[PDB]
Amino acid sequence: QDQICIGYHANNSTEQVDTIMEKNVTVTHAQDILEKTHNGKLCDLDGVKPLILRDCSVAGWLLGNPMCDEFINVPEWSYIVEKANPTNDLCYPGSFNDYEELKHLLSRINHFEKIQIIPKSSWSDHEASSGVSSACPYLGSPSFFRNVVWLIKKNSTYPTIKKSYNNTNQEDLLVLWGIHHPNDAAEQTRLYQNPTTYISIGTSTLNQRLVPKIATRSKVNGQSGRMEFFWTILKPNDAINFESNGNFIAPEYAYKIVKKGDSAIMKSELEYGNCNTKCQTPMGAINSSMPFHNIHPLTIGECPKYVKSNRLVLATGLRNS
Amino acid sequence: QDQICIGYHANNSTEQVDTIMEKNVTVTHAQDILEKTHNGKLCDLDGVKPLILRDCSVAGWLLGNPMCDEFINVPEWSYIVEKANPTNDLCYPGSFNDYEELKHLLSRINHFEKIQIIPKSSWSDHEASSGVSSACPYLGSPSFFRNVVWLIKKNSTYPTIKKSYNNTNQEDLLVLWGIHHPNDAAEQTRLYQNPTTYISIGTSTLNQRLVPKIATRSKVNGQSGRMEFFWTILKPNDAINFESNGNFIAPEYAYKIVKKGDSAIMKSELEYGNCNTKCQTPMGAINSSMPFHNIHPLTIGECPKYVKSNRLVLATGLRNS
Amino acid sequence: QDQICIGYHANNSTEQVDTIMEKNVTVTHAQDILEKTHNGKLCDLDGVKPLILRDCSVAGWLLGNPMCDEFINVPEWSYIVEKANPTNDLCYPGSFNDYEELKHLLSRINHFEKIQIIPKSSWSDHEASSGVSSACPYLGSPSFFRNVVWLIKKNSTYPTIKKSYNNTNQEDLLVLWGIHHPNDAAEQTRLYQNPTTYISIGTSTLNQRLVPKIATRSKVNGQSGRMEFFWTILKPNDAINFESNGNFIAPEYAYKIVKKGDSAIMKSELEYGNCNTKCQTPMGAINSSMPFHNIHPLTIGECPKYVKSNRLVLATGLRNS
Amino acid sequence: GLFGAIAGFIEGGWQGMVDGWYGYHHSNEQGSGYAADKESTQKAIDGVTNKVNSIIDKMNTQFEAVGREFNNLERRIENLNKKMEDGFLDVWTYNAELLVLMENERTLDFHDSNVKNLYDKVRLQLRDNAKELGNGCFEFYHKCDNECMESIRNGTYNYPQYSE
Amino acid sequence: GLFGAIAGFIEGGWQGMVDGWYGYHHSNEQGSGYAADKESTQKAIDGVTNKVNSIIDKMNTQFEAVGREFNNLERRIENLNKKMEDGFLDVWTYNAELLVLMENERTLDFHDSNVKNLYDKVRLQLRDNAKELGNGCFEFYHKCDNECMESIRNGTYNYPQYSE
Amino acid sequence: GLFGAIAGFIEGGWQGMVDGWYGYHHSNEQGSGYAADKESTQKAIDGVTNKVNSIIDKMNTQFEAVGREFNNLERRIENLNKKMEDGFLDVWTYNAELLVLMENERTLDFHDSNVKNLYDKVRLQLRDNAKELGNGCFEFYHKCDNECMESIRNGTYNYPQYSE
Ligand SMILES: CC(=O)N[C@H]1[C@H]([C@H](O)[C@H](O)CO)O[C@@](OC[C@H]2O[C@@H](O)[C@H](O)[C@@H](O)[C@H]2O)(C(=O)O)C[C@@H]1O
Numbered sequence A, B, C: 001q002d003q004i005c006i007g008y009h010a011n012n013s014t015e016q017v018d019t020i021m022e023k024n025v026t027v028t029h030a031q032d033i034l035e036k037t038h039n040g041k042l043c044d045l046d047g048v049k050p051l052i053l054r055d056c057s058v059a060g061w062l063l064g065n066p067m068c069d070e071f072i073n074v075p076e077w078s079y080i081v082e083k084a085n086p087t088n089d090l091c092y093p094g095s096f097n098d099y100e101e102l103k104h105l106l107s108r109i110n111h112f113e114k115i116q117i118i119p120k121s122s123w124s125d126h127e128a129s130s131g132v133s134s135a136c137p138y139l140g141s142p143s144f145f146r147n148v149v150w151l152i153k154k155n156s157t158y159p160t161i162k163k164s165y166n167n168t169n170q171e172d173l174l175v176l177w178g179i180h181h182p183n184d185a186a187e188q189t190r191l192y193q194n195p196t197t198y199i200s201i202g203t204s205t206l207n208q209r210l211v212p213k214i215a216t217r218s219k220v221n222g223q224s225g226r227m228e229f230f231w232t233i234l235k236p237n238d239a240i241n242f243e244s245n246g247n248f249i250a251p252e253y254a255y256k257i258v259k260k261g262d263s264a265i266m267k268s269e270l271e272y273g274n275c276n277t278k279c280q281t282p283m284g285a286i287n288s289s290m291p292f293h294n295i296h297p298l299t300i301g302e303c304p305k306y307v308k309s310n311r312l313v314l315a316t317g318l319r320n321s
Numbered sequence D, E, F: 001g002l003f004g005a006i007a008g009f010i011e012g013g014w015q016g017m018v019d020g021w022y023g024y025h026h027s028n029e030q031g032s033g034y035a036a037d038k039e040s041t042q043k044a045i046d047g048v049t050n051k052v053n054s055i056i057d058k059m060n061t062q063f064e065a066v067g068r069e070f071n072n073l074e075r076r077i078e079n080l081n082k083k084m085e086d087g088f089l090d091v092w093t094y095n096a097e098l099l100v101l102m103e104n105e106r107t108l109d110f111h112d113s114n115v116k117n118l119y120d121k122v123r124l125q126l127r128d129n130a131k132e133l134g135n136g137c138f139e140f141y142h143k144c145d146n147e148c149m150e151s152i153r154n155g156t157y158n159y160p161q162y163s164e
């Protein structure tokens, strides 16, 4: 005799989802919404290559550590990769003022154009080719940071320096300079004659007067002396004025900020891999349509939303048995 | 033949709500819980009027920029309104130490009572009426910040200043002073005679010794010189001690903190409108019984909770067709 | 005639739970998941006792305020308890450089081993037993911070000090020292002869040159003079170098960091109670299997999750009437 | 409809019932009319009203933003500060929107549930004495005057009264 | 009750049933008594137990506050710090309270659902051989001894056995 | 099953139905076969699809972490910064996981609800003309050819046709 039945779909799917009241529930259909895969490489971001600092830090790069000549001229970049502990940094021991605030600026910059604002040849009444150290060796020989010049006395004389530079460019200028902190009064006179010295710096915004600090210090890279570097952004049509009667590490090359944008300083030990992606993490790139991922929080490009989960699956079908 | 039916309400309402599984569902009754309306004005807050800095900054106000005389005496206020970029600030170019920390204090203050702690007339062995500049013009004539006095030499002499002020008031004192940074050694002597100068300041808590920084700087408002201002809160029964042999910008008027409370420094280009509210945003006031609003996060008074949503409606009735 | 009924459990339970649509619903079974009870005592944490600073601050402890001799030698600790306002702090008025950053380090340290790096007896050409003040009294007599030594002139002479200390230990060294800020030039010479003085300090990482600030100040604990203290972590195999011709408050005792770990600086007025717990709050200890608690946010040990709720009960059974 | 009543076996709503959300329509000798079941209608009101007040009171201690300023060399903390307030702003916007979406769905199914329970209340009283038409109506096997109808409405229907 | 069983067509609960949440009461020649349906009672236990453990494990990595200090000229970061911990504290207090409110409602309706499903399990076996009284009871049209009752309780009722 | 259909009175699913989630199996003279009720199957698709897209769009403005650095004497703000990003990271991980857990439960009960509503749609049409077996099947009291079956499937069953 005739009859009719109402029923539901079932299949050979062992896909599981979790609920509040029961875990590992087998369903007929399920959508995974979590990406758990990367390619293990550092790639370009939409065609534009990252600046991969290899064994160098931002400081070595910007100040021009001789061990960092690979980065003397740097094309436009998408993001920056720096290691946990770059071995090439301050070859001459010392410090970098507002280092972290500077690295933060680099996150909104994509391109630097290196230009010579004060040529090394332009120093007439001072020695500009003897400012070297075995702490910054290049190919065995004592050398120094390439973008700044360590001036000393000439013919037992260090005349007071009065130098100006006007920013006639339309872009902001990253300008770098420094002071040398000797280790005794004999070294001070032997290098700069004048026992009492200063460095004054002025823009429309900056007004600082530096004095060297004599101090006995432990040797770092063979030197007890110290180099302390400072920086400023020079606005277009503004000028920077230097005055000094010793211990001045003058700028030679500065940086035109020609491209602002969305960047990042990524921490990774990985090196460049000839590849391309739209989403990059410190441990590899993501190519996914997924809304979520659990690879790394620090991300750049068009990426899924990072979550600490190791599993995220949405039920779409119904129970199965 | 007799019969009875069970049914539900329906009406002529096209009010819609959203669900997780379906959007734009028509219901019989719905409650909107989101306020999306403001009056476009800056109002009083429960009767007490805001201090509306017009083209002046906090600095111009407190230091007494001649362009800011509207705010020489200021009644108690509810909140402060300041523009994105006030044109009247440091008329004489320079800086304000811990400016942001000071503006943060202003958020817990509602009233200032301006009082004269050191009268301009009390300077006998110095010139106290020549401390003016074409960088701070008043009605064409060169003038200066009104609450501080720029002292110079008298009869080619700047005797070392030793001045004390005891806070015999029961309220904290906002005290302001400054130092002048000349642009060369000729200007230093021409103004203060003494080539080597200092300013020492002491309370029970403060112990600072300022020295002027000679530096060549680009002209700002026609001046390459710089004024650097400092501040301190003077506790009741504590005293402030000044010593100086030049470059001292002494206080004349200080601020009694007579009303502490809940305030704010609001950023807005809007001006005062003769109105009253219990909730104020930078772009207008809210008069609502709503629990939520989407107008502006930065709010003061009794306000709804800010949310980024553009629509929030709760179903109360049932489906309709 | 025979019949069968389907029904549900009911009992004499007045336990209530709340829902979104109805509050105070009586159920047959309910699980409370919120701990609302503490013992009102400061206990050990898993056997290891806390360091309870009584009327002393971290500064008094570390610098060796004579009022703080209870803490001259301190066993390993679990957490630190400090009052809201310790009365024994800087007996001689002044300041502590980077005080908060130092207290933050203490949160990752569990044990200090006090050692003598420069013995008071080792000062031959200076007076090392006259550096006392009625601002730091011990048992009536004028005394001073015990871990640092206030040196003065000897036979109307203060020869320039050149002292080094190498950290031959395997642990980091907390090293403390200070400078004295006199109140006039007569006091400067009367104590140190030399009218112009400095203190230079160098490690492989530190490079500072301190100069004293003459200033007229209000009396605090009877003194208008000021003591300003500085600190540094000395890395193993690194050395600290001092040079000074006056105003130097040299270290005598420093701190070996022999135990790093999970600690905390807890704020509480409570004192030690002879008890033990696995979870400690500023107002008492918790002994609970509960997942939540509402006692205090600032917690240490294995604790429930803090929540602002005053009631959290989960329905497990069903409705009851 | 999760409970299959509203827009389910009961095709549409009644424009004619204005005294409540759920109720009855009767058809006998004495006349015809609509009537609201106050008990289930009030219970619905008391439910939805509590739900609204509970949604409101759970978000009364949200996160208000204050204003802070930072100079040109405090960009890190300025950025930290900004992301943090945008942070809390985002999670509280998520909360409000999600809660509304979730409880709106519950509310509609709540009303759907109420309608079926009301239907079953009448259905379980009548039993034999009437037959289910299939649209929310029962056709009686006897005569049900206003007194009989009200007995059904207040759950005091005297089943002992025949059929056929 | 969303499913209309508890406090619905079944007026009250049984003080006499102590072996489980849901079950049966029978009345025949051999005697009377209560009995708990272990299957649906265990399934309820396994559900609510998981629910509690899941609520707990989702809030095990919450946000613990640490202590930081700031001097008199770091009021901005001090305030930022304070609002931030109060911030996380508020959203996690919202989470716990809301989750409890929402799942409590589910739990009660879960129990309500279980009762009706149990009722329908017996109802769909008996069919003709008994009649629905309307209070959760079926009046038999035959004699059901303990063996017959247990057959109903374990879903092995042999319908082939007459009526009238 | 909250609605008692799936794995309830209907013991298992049909491997043979591939055209939809819910449907019918018929048995008459002309033959036998499976058929999917497109209306309730589409409504289920449109529901679950919206649910997935809504879960996704509510978490599209989450909280991305940026990189900041701090020197050896900024440990407080460094720690503040770290706890803050770990903070937002934790609440958004809680959100995603919880939402998935909650809506997964809803989805399964949604499907369970759809099955029972479909059953009741057929049940309320047949009435006398067939009898409920108790497993989701109705045994007819007349002959139902493909035309009659389709009438049942599209809710146009002509009840006027006898029994016994
Ligand atoms: C520009 C210059 O003078 N470079 C010197 C450098 C500087 O004198 C010094 O770094 C300043 O702080 O010194 C270097 O080593 C010098 C070394 O010579 C030893 O013989 C001497 O006994 C030591 O005291 C020490 O000065 C260096 O390479 O950095 C030499 C360099 O030419």
Ligand SMILES: CC(=O)N[C@H]1[C@H]([C@H](O)[C@H](O)CO)O[C@@](OC[C@H]2O[C@@H](O)[C@H](O)[C@@H](O)[C@H]2O)(C(=O)O)C[C@@H]1O
Pocket: B130, B131, B132, B133, B134, B135, B142, B150, B152, B181, B182, B183, B187, B191, B223, B224, B225, B226
């Ligand atoms: C109190 C006082 O001396 N005010 C002067 C002011 C100061 O000398 C100066 O600002 C200090 O930094 O200078 C002002 O302009 C002076 C201007 O005069 C030119 O002729 C000269 O060639 C320039 O070098 C420059 O000094 C001023 O108005 O601010 C004049 C003011 O009277």
Ligand SMILES: CC(=O)N[C@H]1[C@H]([C@H](O)[C@H](O)CO)O[C@@](OC[C@H]2O[C@@H](O)[C@H](O)[C@@H](O)[C@H]2O)(C(=O)O)C[C@@H]1O
Pocket: C130, C131, C132, C133, C134, C135, C142, C150, C152, C181, C182, C183, C187, C191, C223, C224, C225, C226
């Ligand atoms: C090491 C030493 O000299 N201790 C002195 C101390 C110092 O002179 C002073 O603290 C440096 O800042 O001074 C103390 O009081 C001195 C007190 O004596 C009065 O008679 C005099 O009129 C005051 O000016 C003042 O100097 C002290 O106890 O701290 C004395 C201490 O011996």
Ligand SMILES: *[C@@H]1O[C@H](CO)[C@@H](O)[C@H](O)[C@H]1NC(C)=O
Pocket: A166, A167, A237, A238, A239, B218, B219
């Ligand atoms: C830089 O030079 C231009 C003219 O070449 C001038 O307009 C500008 O003022 C100069 N900048 C400064 C600060 O001197």
Ligand SMILES: *[C@@H]1O[C@H](CO)[C@@H](O)[C@H](O)[C@H]1NC(C)=O
Pocket: B166, B167, B237, B238, B239, C218, C219
């Ligand atoms: C201020 O003066 C009062 C007496 O008039 C005195 O008590 C107080 O100590 C003085 N303050 C200072 C710091 O000298």
Ligand SMILES: *[C@@H]1O[C@H](CO)[C@@H](O)[C@H](O)[C@H]1NC(C)=O
Pocket: A218, A219, C166, C167, C237, C238, C239
């Ligand atoms: C400390 O002494 C050891 C040898 O005893 C030496 O290796 C080390 O370099 C010294 N440290 C410094 C900084 O001089």
